[PDB]
């Protein structure tokens, strides 16, 4: 695990206090997919794989973007399973 202080959903949810309202991806589904707000623009990191994501568009799924960019993540696999990841990566 990279940021151990963000392993709990509620810890991650607090970082989304300064999240811009303009961003069209919800802090709830971002904190659910392992992401926490880093403090600048829309930059989010996975507490587990340390993978960073940004430039969130409308109609994005944080879990799908998690598997699209960091599929070998030991948290994405424990939460959504390899059968979700393989359908996304193998598209």
């Amino acid at each position: 695990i990279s940021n151990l202080s963000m392993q709990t959903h509620a810890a991650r949810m607090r970082t989304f206090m300064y999240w811009p309202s303009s961003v069209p991806v919800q802090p709830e589904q971002l904190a659910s997919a392992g992401f926490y707000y880093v403090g600048r623009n829309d930059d989010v990191k996975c507490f587990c794989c340390d993978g960073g994501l940004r430039c969130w568009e409308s109609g994005d799924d944080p879990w799908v973007e998690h598997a699209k960019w960091f599929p070998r993540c030991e948290f994405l696999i424990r939460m959504k399973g390899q059968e979700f990841v393989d359908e996304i990566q193998g598209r």
Partner: protein
């Protein structure tokens, strides 16, 4: 000499530079005298067997406006691509930080064109030409980087904004897929680090470039400079220009301005 291979014992890691497209990059000294950038190539994405053999072609390229590749450390996992160090970092953040004069903006396009004209002569493909891949040295000169690595291994990803309709649809790479990627790069340069098709999503962008939607003329781009970057975006790849044609269109505007 050295068989394009560097002894990793002669590499001193000084500072972290950040995560690139194809791996994390560090800064240091090769033989304690030479300033280098060591790219640790990401595990799982690369075959390593496919790269180890074909890398010899890529190393033999030598050009002023191409990031000097010093050598590779293939003897381990991850492989390390040791190259020269580019003080001003990448073009994308560099424009975003800055304000230049427009003759400085055109000059940047001219450095990238001169390097693409060279790769075009050697039948090599960049495949991933964008401001995030071009690097800027301590003298403000742009040099092309991250070439070919794309050819050694989702629903709708971000490089859709840099790709022509034949790449979005059939995934057909050629010197015309790189001519188009250069016109988009000219647009990023004149728009000062702006995102191409910023109002559209990754998926909306695909069914818009396909329909015939193009990038609007940047505020800093003159109506004749916009003609050069618009040449690059022909619906039919065959009626697109060459890096030598483009270089001559660019050098015409440098005299018709100064």
């Amino acid at each position: 000499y050295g068989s394009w291979e560097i002894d990793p014992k002669d590499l001193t890691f000084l500072k972290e530079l950040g995560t690139g497209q194809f791996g994390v990059v560090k800064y240091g000294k090769w033989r304690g005298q030479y300033d280098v950038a060591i790219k640790m190539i990401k595990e799982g994405s690369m075959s390593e067997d496919e790269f180890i053999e074909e890398a010899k072609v890529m190393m033999n390229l030598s050009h002023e406006k191409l990031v000097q590749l010093y050598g590779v450390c293939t003897k381990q996992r991850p492989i390390f691509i040791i190259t020269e160090y580019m003080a001003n970092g990448c073009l994308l953040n560099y424009l975003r930080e800055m304000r230049f004069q427009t003759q400085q903006l055109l000059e940047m396009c001219k450095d990238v064109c001169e390097a693409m004209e060279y790769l075009e002569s050697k039948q090599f493909l960049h495949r991933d030409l964008a401001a995030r891949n071009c690097l800027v040295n301590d003298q403000g000169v742009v040099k092309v980087s991250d070439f070919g690595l794309s050819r050694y291994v989702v629903g709708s990803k971000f490089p859709v904004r840099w790709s022509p309709p034949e790449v979005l649809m059939y995934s057909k790479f050629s010197s015309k897929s790189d001519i188009w990627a250069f016109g988009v790069l000219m647009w990023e340069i004149y728009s000062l680090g702006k995102m191409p098709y910023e109002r559209f999503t990754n998926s909306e962008t695909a069914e818009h470039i396909a329909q015939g939607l193009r990038l609007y003329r940047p505020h800093l781009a003159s109506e004749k400079v916009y003609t050069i970057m618009y040449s690059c975006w022909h619906e039919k790849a065959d009626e697109r220009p060459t890096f030598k044609i483009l270089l001559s269109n660019i050098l015409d505007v440098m005299d018709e301005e100064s």
